[PDB]
Amino acid sequence: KTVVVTTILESPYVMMKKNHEMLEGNERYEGYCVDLAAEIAKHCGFKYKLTIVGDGKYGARDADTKIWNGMVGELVYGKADIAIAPLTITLVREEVIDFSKPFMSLGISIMIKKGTPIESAEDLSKQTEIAYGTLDSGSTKEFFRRSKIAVFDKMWTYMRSAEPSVFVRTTAEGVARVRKSKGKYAYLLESTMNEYIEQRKPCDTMKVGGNLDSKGYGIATPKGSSLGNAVNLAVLKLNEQGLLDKLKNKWWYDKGEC
Amino acid sequence: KTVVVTTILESPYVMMKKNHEMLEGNERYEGYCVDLAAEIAKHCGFKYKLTIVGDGKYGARDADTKIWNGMVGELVYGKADIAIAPLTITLVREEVIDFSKPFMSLGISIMIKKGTPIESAEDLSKQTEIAYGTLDSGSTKEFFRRSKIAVFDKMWTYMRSAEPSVFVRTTAEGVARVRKSKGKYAYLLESTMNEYIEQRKPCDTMKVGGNLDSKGYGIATPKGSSLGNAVNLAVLKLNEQGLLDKLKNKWWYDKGEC
């Protein structure tokens, strides 16, 4: 009955506490999703164990093997009971796992090194000098790959053929590339992460333009799991009681450094 | 077999076309939810009949009889098969009906007549010359009635006992009250309607401040319904293809008059 929670090391959702090495179990981690996991568990009445997804991914179906990787795979193949992370609710995922109503709203956004002469996706598409990419698996890449909006189709056409690769394995990798490229690389990531980074030292990046789309993160469970109903209701209750807005402010803005 | 769709006359979601008297059935109406209903039915493969909710309400439970009114009641008591409307996903409603994932995100906002000395809820709570209320039943009124947050708790106390009533029966009545009250009345309504009206003639109102919460509208079905699954998947598909964004620009800003 101890619920195995799969999640991912992604700031400020789940981060290692500075002393984690002298701590045990759930106490080793801190962050928005660590706080949310505690509350979901308390309102649903279950004991849980946080575990970091082994391959460090969000989740995508390999087109050859057709095997799901990341947190989605952990749920699909029975290695975890629930996923509490910045996991995007999408059609292909909803087809294999269950999602609660969203606990956070977001949209794909553009992250630039300050001073970059870019102001929108249209600007990125109309030039070639500043390279741009996305996480190499997950909802953002899939959004561009399936987009039929020309500004986005043009962007995908370029990204899928750019060399060296413009895709990165982790959010941190994308942010570092932005920071170390003197303005020649812009990163396409979720508004939530983009807004977070813009508030952290060295305060050299910023989110530009509006969001490209609109969607949410949901707490996921294995298709038909017994936890789904209570978890969904708990998210709604916690949102209505102001918990979610409080956690957003606590982890994004209250200890912002810029 | 023809699906009975319950919806509500609320601009620009569902409105009577100018020439509706000489039109019939579903053709009499136009709007975002009318376009959405057509997109959902096509993907889920069903024929439908649009019907305006009899009592003109969104849906709330009478504390004494425990009977649901509005579109929620029409689903609860079997008078309709699905509600395609700007119906807000809430915990009390989710307990009695099913909601698809969000097709639109929004938040409670403040509508003022241009030039009114108000910039936030807080601003409304610390004065008494400017009355302010909400729709008479629905998710907004509940929000203030259930607030564990100080500014808002203060707002319910004044609202619940103001006399005469600061509550209104329809969004239109709330908007008209703002407009003819020479700035002595502000109306609390969802950002979607607020932003919409703000872009319509006589262009004398405006949304002030930020949203008070974050939530969404969902397509609702009776508990356990055969349509729940397909509808939910259709919403996600429509969002990802950009149809939902397309419809929003179509009905909100493409014809704006200010």
Ligand SMILES: N[C@@H](Cc1conc1O)C(=O)O
């Ligand atoms: N939440 C996303 C991952 C993600 C995080 O930030 N940009 C992204 O693409 C997912 O679920 O793939």
Ligand SMILES: N[C@@H](Cc1conc1O)C(=O)O
């Ligand atoms: N969407 C709300 C109603 C509503 C619309 O605009 N302000 C409101 O309160 C509901 O479903 O009750």
Ligand SMILES: [Zn+2]
């Ligand atoms: Zn379609």
Ligand SMILES: [Zn+2]
């Ligand atoms: Zn009564």
